[PDB]
Amino acid sequence: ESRLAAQMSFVVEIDKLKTILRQTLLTDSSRRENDAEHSWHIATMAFLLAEYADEAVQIGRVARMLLIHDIVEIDAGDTFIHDDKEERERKAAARLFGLLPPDQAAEYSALWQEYEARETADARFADALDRLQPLLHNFETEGGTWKPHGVTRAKVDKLLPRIEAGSKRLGAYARALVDEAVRRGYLAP
Amino acid sequence: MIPFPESRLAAQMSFVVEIDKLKTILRQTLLTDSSRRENDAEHSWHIATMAFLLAEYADEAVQIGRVARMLLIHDIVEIDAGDTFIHDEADKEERERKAAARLFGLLPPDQAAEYSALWQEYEARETADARFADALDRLQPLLHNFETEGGTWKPHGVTRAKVDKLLPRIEAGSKRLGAYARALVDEAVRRGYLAP
Ligand SMILES: [Ca+2]
Numbered sequence: 222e223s224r225l226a227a228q229m230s231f232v233v234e235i236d237k238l239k240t241i242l243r244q245t246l247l248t249d250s251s252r253r254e255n256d257a258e259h260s261w262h263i264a265t266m267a268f269l270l271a272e273y274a275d276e277a278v279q280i281g282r283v284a285r286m287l288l289i290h291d292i293v294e295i296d297a298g299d300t301f302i303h304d305d306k307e308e309r310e311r312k313a314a315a316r317l318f319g320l321l322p323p324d325q326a327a328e329y330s331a332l333w334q335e336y337e338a339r340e341t342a343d344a345r346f347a348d349a350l351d352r353l354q355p356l357l358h359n360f361e362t363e364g365g366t367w368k369p370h371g372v373t374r375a376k377v378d379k380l381l382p383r384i385e386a387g388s389k390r391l392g393a394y395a396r397a398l399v400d401e402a403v404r405r406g407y408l409a410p
Numbered sequence: 411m412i413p414f415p416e417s418r419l420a421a422q423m424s425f426v427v428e429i430d431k432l433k434t435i436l437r438q439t440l441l442t443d444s445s446r447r448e449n450d451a452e453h454s455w456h457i458a459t460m461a462f463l464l465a466e467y468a469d470e471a472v473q474i475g476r477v478a479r480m481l482l483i484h485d486i487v488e489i490d491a492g493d494t495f496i497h498d499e500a501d502k503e504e505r506e507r508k509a510a511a512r513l514f515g516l517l518p519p520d521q522a523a524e525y526s527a528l529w530q531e532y533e534a535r536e537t538a539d540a541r542f543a544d545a546l547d548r549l550q551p552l553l554h555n556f557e558t559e560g561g562t563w564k565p566h567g568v569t570r571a572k573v574d575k576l577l578p579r580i581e582a583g584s585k586r587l588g589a590y591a592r593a594l595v596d597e598a599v600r601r602g603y604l605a606p
Contacts, residue, residue: 225586225590228463229553229590231463232456232459232460232463232464232550232553233442233553233557235456235459236441236442236443236456236554236557237442237443238452238455238492239446239448239452239455239456240441240443247430247433247434248427248430248431249430249431249434254433255452257451257452257455257456258433258449258451258452258455259456260455261432261451261452261453261455261458261482262426262430262433264428264455264458264482265426265429265482265483266426266476268479268482269422269425269426269517269521270422270426275577279477280475281474281475281478281479282475284458284475284479284482285459285462285475285478287505288455288459288462288478289459292518296486319601321463325463357426357427358427358430361427361430374575380452390419394423405469
């Protein structure tokens with residue numbers, strides 16, 4: 222009974238990801254986005270946008286990776302990308318994934334490590350989607366996150382190679398979006 | 411001005427942007443700390459993650475990645491149709507059919523049909539994938555009600571008899587998860603979280 226008990230303890234504990242607030246507001250500006258609903262959104266993108274991945278990418282695995290990528294933030298908190306972290310997240314991973322049975326603890330902690338390293342095919346596609354989504358959001362909200370955080374083209378352009386690493390097509394989309402964003406005054410030069 | 415060859419990707423992105431709105435649709439399930447109601451997007455995150463974690467309890471014929479995808483999209487229709495509490499008897503079919511047409515209709519035609527069908531499959535709870543998806547979706551609120559000491563059950567007058575009507579849906583996806591769920595509900599009744 223202790224295997225399922227451990228699994229259920231993890232399922233219950235990770236509810237707390239819903240409480241971890243990002244700097245992003247929702248597209249309706251009503252409230253801050255949380256980590257759990259953000260991971261839902263990116264994971265959904267992995268399936269919708271699967272055709273743009275390299276052939277080696279395992280889309281279901283990318284989805285699983287994206288669903289678990291921010292679990293460490295339960296203990297480590299959220300940091301805005303444009304603003305100790307590694308150590309806090311390592312400790313978080315040990316405690317949180319440590320709730321699982323040992324096989325799954327090792328599997329999921331390694332899958333999270335793999336996401337952070339952004340080396341493998343799956344990790345690059347995952348990371349590309351995660352980096353793409355705030356561009357889509359910011360364009361839709363006329364710079365709703367960029368403006369209140371004083372984000373510049375320099376800081377955004379620096380992240381574009383991460384999208385390109387996951388998909389040349391999505392990279393090209395992102396570049397055109399950023400240029401038009403600056404044109405329109407959504408993003409400071 | 412989106413050139414004609416960019417049409418497919420633009421349609422896909424229009425859907426990606428639109429579905430932000432799922433985050434604003436609230437359920438009656440509380441977070442485990444009773445701090446607020448759960449929203450549909452974070453609910454779908456949670457159940458899709460459970461699909462992967464609890465995969466070993468699925469029938470051999472289930473494709474777990476497909477279950478995950480199905481769960482990620484299963485509530486998109488609620489953007490337009492809203493949430494309906496499972497025990498609330500009082501046009502849901504028509505609302506949801508119209509929602510599906512508008513929302514999935516943002517996608518390119520191949521994916522509009524694909525994703526609509528996948529949602530329909532989930533709702534029908536006939537296929538192996540749909541049964542496992544539905545079992546996970548029905549288990550999670552039980553977990554939360556146990557954590558919140560009947561934080562949804564009591565205010566809504568939910569009784570053991572009403573919950574017992576739902577438990578076979580869990581059993582239909584996994585006998586082991588069904589047994590867990592029944593034992594959890596037995597304990598909830600003993601603790602007074604759930605009217606007998
Ligand atoms: Ca509930």
